[PDB]
Amino acid sequence: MLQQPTGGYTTLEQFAFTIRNDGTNATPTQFLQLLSYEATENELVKKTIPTPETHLPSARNVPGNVYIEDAITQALFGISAQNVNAHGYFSRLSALALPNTSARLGLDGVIYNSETINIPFYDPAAVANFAATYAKLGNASTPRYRADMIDIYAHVGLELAGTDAERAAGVMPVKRAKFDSWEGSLISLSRDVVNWKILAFLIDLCSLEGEALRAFKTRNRDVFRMMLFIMSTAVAANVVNRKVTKRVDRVLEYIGVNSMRTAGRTATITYDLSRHEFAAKFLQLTFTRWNA
Amino acid sequence: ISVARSMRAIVNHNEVDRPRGAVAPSSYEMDTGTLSRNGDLLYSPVANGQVGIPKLEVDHISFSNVVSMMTANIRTGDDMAVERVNPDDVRAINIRNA
Amino acid sequence: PALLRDFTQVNWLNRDITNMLQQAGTKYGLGLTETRLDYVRLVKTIVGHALNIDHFAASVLNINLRALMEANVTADDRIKALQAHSMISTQFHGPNQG
Amino acid sequence: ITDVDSTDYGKLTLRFLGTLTRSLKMQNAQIRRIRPDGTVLRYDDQIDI
Amino acid sequence: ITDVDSTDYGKLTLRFLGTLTRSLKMQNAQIRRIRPDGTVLRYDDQIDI
Amino acid sequence: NIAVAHTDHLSVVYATMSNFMLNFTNNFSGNHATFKPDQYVITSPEGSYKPIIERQGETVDGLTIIDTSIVWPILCQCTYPLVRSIMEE
Amino acid sequence: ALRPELAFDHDHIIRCLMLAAANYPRLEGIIVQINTGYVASANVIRPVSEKRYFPENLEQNQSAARLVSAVKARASEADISSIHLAIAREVSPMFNVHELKKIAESFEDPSSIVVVLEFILFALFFPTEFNRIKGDIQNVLLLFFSRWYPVEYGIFVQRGATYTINAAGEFEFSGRNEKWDQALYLSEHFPALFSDVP
Amino acid sequence: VFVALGIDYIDIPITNSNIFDDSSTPYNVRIWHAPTMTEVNHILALMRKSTLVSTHSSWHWNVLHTFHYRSESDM
Amino acid sequence: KVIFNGLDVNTEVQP
């Protein structure tokens, strides 16, 4: 078992979040510096997010060790994932939600049904807290519990593009992001993100409390913003490049507006409708936790 | 010329410790690295807390790699069998309202 | 080339190879790097071998297997196509291969 | 060596999936009641035999 | 160079069609609705699939 | 017409059959509303996990799928020793 | 009178049985083959040539043709081994979770009630095996109830298609209609049609 | 009626207000099975994926209903 | 007609 430090698990060098960029392992904050925003005539205003349902989906009797981190990160940023609701293994998180369960969540990101040798795993209390909210990824598809998938992206916009004045106001102009870019930039970004051990980020987000929690939100804000960025490119209505005198500026439009597109494109990862419901639910839960 | 060259003079000179101009294979030829969660191939991390550099990102060739492959347990593309059950009465079949 | 280590007569070569292999940044391997099993059958499904292969072809092969595995559609989904081409309210049974 | 028919042992004889082979390895294995959640419960003399 | 695989029904549909394709230009060919007036419409995110 | 042959004979057969050495599980408790089978696995810290009861789908043994229609021959196409000159040991 | 042999190891034979059930697929079939042999030696049921499915002479009757086809749809020919297997399955341990052979019925004609009866009879003659397949039969029953009693089916399904018993034994219904799968037999859930809750 | 039918919707033809004209109706209304607000959000978001549909700011019987027009001009 | 504990399969969907 891996002890959780006074800071989150994310404080450990083992869980560094870093996209590739300019031939080096850039941290997300120093990629997001590259991002620049063209405000347009439209305005995003953030509605209150509905409280996530109390219900935790049943973890059906599953003998196997479900690879959950892979499932989640693929559902959010996977290039090729689809029908992320037909399998319904996200419900498995609920198995961890019980006090004193024999199950453990490995750093590998797999949910073992019993503690097992030579497999490091998160402190069960923290994971219990994390499962108590994120098991609800299991009802991302269930009709009674589906998240809004239009309104929520306003928050994404505000947390990604929004200036501190806009984030304070709760309203920003709809923005059109851009950055100097390499060939296939959004894909490689999305995959550098897919490899991230986000379970660390989530477990710290759910277990930490008090000042130590708030210090997390600031330390990890740019990471969360990168996930929000990959996701926003996934739903961005269009994504062009611009010639800029022997340089190329990738331009995704627009931040905070889910176009609900499902047809694929070479430029970015694409959400099937199931992935839209899933990402919506994930955003609902994670944003609900990011504001408290 | 010989942009394609990897090794040269795999022999040992009896006087000097290495032949002049003999060249070892690039280290990248031997870093199998890892298959990432994305299915992208990565070279081994050069330090702790560093992710591996993806192999497609850079121009060096890498002659060992982790290919995922399905086992005998999988089998895709085989024909599969089903029982088909016709509706009992044609006039009982509904169209609208769906 | 990494297999020549401690196995070739040409000393400088084996020294340079042993050096690149003893770097932290590079680490050769050959064989069954990973094993994903079914969550229900408990049998192995997708293995990950470290083949001696160019990273380009390994990347194409991995893209393919990834396209198959991440789709999350099975043979059973074929009944939907059947349900489309068969008379309305026709029933289709089995075999739930998963 | 002991003249037993170990055929189909450690296996699944599915009609449609064919025969499949599970690992026979189980060092220190124990018979334990599991939760419907699928996770193991600590052995309880009160209910388990 | 690439003599594509085809089922016998496919060979039949091929010969039925069943010849030249070269007449069409395809340089940045796109699929778009035209107005009955004959003007070529831009892709409507709400109408065209 | 058949009820005697069931309740007054075949029931006895079920009773004794219940005591057989290999009928080792508790199969039902007579309460559809509450009964669930007790579930066991062979599990090890080294990571093995073998459920005794699994849902694998139709097996080669041909014992998994149930044709309920077996009920019909039993009701309308079967003599019994208690049911059919009618003396029969 | 002392038999000079080793004592029957209850505690060991039970573990070896659990281990076999975990690792050895034939075991179910082996144990069954014993009980079947027992039923076969108990000489309790014998298949006969004379089917007795219909009153005279409704099978001859024209109005009854739909109902008669409906019964002949269900009436399996008697086979000794299949019946012995039924009786035996009632007491043999189950290892792979039993599935219902699925029924297609849409419950339009009144004669469709036959399927319901085929289940009721199955509940009686084999309460145990019925208990194993009962959710799968609940799927057919729901097609029945949605037709014959749509208002009641509305309220019932509105309570929920399943439930879970909690601490202190109180039922907690799902509040949501959904199809049962035998994947649920090993789960906390029960089909709600059998809750017997008013 | 939805739980009883297992359908996700019904599609009612609209009345022509004058009873004398028998001309084909411009659109039909589709009543949806969406008891909760969340189900309605989902049906709306899916509705933006498909042509020639529109809906009222709020619906009668408190049940979500969407107009589907047979042509652009009718809309 | 005849009792058959298995699924009574009777068609083959192609891939």
From TrEMBL, chain A:
It comes from Bombyx mori cytoplasmic polyhedrosis virus (BmCPV). The chain holds residues 1 to 292 of 448 of the full protein. The gene is VP5. This is Viral structural protein 5. It comes from the Viruses.
From TrEMBL, chain H:
The chain holds residues 153 to 227 of 1058 of the full protein. This is Structural protein VP3. It comes from the Viruses.
